[PDB]
Design a protein around this ligand. Structure first.
Ligand SMILES: Nc1ncnc2c1ncn2[C@@H]1O[C@H](COP(=O)(O)OP(N)(=O)O)[C@@H](O)[C@H]1O
Ligand SMILES: [Cl-]
Ligand SMILES: [Cl-]
Ligand SMILES: [Cl-]
Length: 386
């Protein structure tokens, strides 16, 4: 009877519950309101979430992430050929054409389908909700990108069933974000909603229309390889070159462990730069026992990412063109995804929409789970959010 909403994200997942008209986003064991979509296998144990992401640089080969890029795809798809360059783990094609993720677990070679890896993330999110409620949870609404095809959606549903969840429904991520803000029950008249979703690995822009509680996805666009990880890479590339100028041409990029440790600190400094004017990137004994330290101003970060930030407007213009509508016709702009916390991105979107304030009251990396939790409560017969 208890139903949860789960945002099964590319890089982070989130679980919410809507009870008595109110939505609680549930913190995991480490107090984190989102959980990495990571699964790691060691000589002794299977780690999921924070523990898996935390040891990724020490166990790259057996730490799986990005299973959402493989779920419901045939291994031969060109997107798999292209994406696999970014994965330290091995992916091979099975006789059925499905991807098989290969890891070592307790000294043995193991293979998993993408939906098996995703089922472990879903099981962790289910357990996070169960620990909070103190009761077992069986029903869930799980979200997927609006462009996900039938195979990708069915494999996501199968991942839910493997995790022990009764999937009440698979719904679109942009629609879940709009439902979170009560835009389906506000005004009644026709509303054009733009969802601007910039996460860790992907960028999705969706233009929705809503007449009388009915959402329709009119147009979608974006870039499946533009996200926060790309802004971290701009900081990494700068630091690699800065280390060269400081230490007689020494190249950190030759050591993959040095790059991973540098990337971890680049991502931390980036987050700091969303609320501070400066941040320090520091890695003790980075390469050749040399300590690395640099100060990055928000202005320098904005400069390194200038083109990537500005180019987020290209898919915005594309959805408006496809839907045959002017930017002045957009009633609400909803910011979704952890990267929408970057002040420069918020300013670019606001200026594009002629000073219109975007809807960002809900923590952007929680809005999809928040909407899914609302839909899960409605599908369970609870009309309290209405
Ligand atoms: N305060 C912040 N400033 C800039 N970026 C931030 C941030 N808080 C989170 N992020 C970024 O959000 C991205 C994760 O986005 P999120 O919406 O949680 O994940 P996902 N699975 O939908 O891709 C990461 O690249 C992370 O660095
Ligand atoms: Cl419920
Ligand atoms: Cl409780
Ligand atoms: Cl929809």
């Amino acid at each position: 009877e208890v139903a949860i909403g789960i945002d099964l994200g590319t890089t982070y997942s989130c679980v919410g519950i809507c009870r008595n008209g109110v939505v609680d986003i549930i913190a995991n064991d480490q107090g984190n309101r989102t959980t990495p979509s990571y699964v790691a296998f060691t000589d002794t144990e299977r780690l999921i979430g924070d523990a898996a992401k935390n040891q990724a640089s020490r166990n790259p080969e057996n730490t799986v992430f990005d299973a959402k890029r493989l779920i419901g795809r045939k291994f031969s798809e060109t997107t798999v050929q292209s994406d696999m360059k970014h994965w330290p783990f091995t992916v091979k094609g099975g006789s059925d054409g499905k991807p098989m993720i290969e890891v070592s677990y307790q000294g043995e070679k193991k293979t998993f389908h993408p939906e098996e890896i995703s089922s472990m993330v879903l099981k962790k999110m289910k357990e996070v909700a169960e620990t909070y409620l103190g009761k077992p949870v069986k029903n869930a609404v799980i979200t997927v990108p609006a462009y996900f095809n039938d195979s990708q959606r069915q494999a996501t549903k199968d991942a839910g069933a493997i995790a022990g969840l009764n999937v009440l429904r698979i719904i679109n991520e942009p629609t879940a974000a709009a439902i979170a803000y009560g835009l389906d029950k506000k005004g009644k008249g026709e509303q054009n909603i733009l969802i601007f979703d910039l996460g860790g690995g992907t960028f999705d822009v969706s233009l929705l229309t809503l007449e009388d509680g009915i959402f329709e996805v009119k147009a979608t666009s974006g870039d499946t390889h533009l996200g926060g990880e790309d802004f971290d890479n701009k900081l990494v590339n700068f630091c690699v070159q800065d280390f060269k100028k400081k230490n007689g041409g020494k190249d950190v990029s030759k050591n993959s462990k040095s790059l991973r440790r540098l990337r971890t600190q680049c991502e931390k400094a980036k987050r700091v730069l969303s609320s501070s004017a400066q941040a320090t990137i520091e890695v003790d004994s980075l390469f050749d026992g040399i300590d690395y330290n640099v100060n990055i101003t928000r202005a320098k970060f904005e400069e390194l990412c200038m083109d990537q930030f500005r180019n987020t407007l290209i898919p915005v213009e594309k959805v408006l063109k496809d839907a045959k509508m002017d930017k002045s016709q957009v009633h609400e702009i909803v910011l979704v995804g952890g990267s929408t916390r970057i002040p420069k991105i918020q300013q670019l979107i606001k200026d594009f929409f002629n000073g219109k304030e975007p809807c960002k009251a809900i923590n952007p990396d929680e809005a999809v789970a928040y909407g899914a939790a609302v839909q899960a409560a409605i599908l369970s017969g609870d009309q309290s959010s209405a």
